[PDB]
Amino acid sequence: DLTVRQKGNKVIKPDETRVKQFLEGFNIETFEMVGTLSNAQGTFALVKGAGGVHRVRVGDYLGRNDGKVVGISEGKIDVIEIVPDGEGNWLERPRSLTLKERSLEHHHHHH
Structure with missing residues (x-):
């Protein structure tokens, strides 16, 4: 095992x-x-994407930003993703994935 402190x-x-x-x-x-x-066994999180279903728990990673799992709720999942600063360096990006539901939004330019 390994520590999850930073x-x-x-x-x-x-x-x-x-x-x-x-x-x-x-x-x-x-x-x-x-x-x-x-x-x-613990607390796991179920997500859908890439035309399929995936399962990850605290510690695992997901997404091109290596979104690491830090929190897992019943209606939201806390994960730390890696994003650029604007010059070249990267930084932490705490994002929460809420349970799928009725919603809608446009697409972003920068990927």
Whole structure:
């Protein structure tokens, strides 16, 4: 196992050597929280994307921004994603994925 603590930023640039997951090739926002599981085994999160279903728990990663799992609720999932600062450096991006539901929004320019 490994510690999940982090002070400041300690962010790093993306590479073509790190773990290459099928879901890691798609945006983190494109995904939509489907459900959540909680039992003796622990707390897992169910999300849909890339034309399929995926399951990850605290510690795992998802999205091209390596969205790490930090929080898992019944109606929202807290995860830390990596995003650019605007010059070249990266930074942490705490985003919460709420359970899928009726909604709508336009698309973003920068991907």
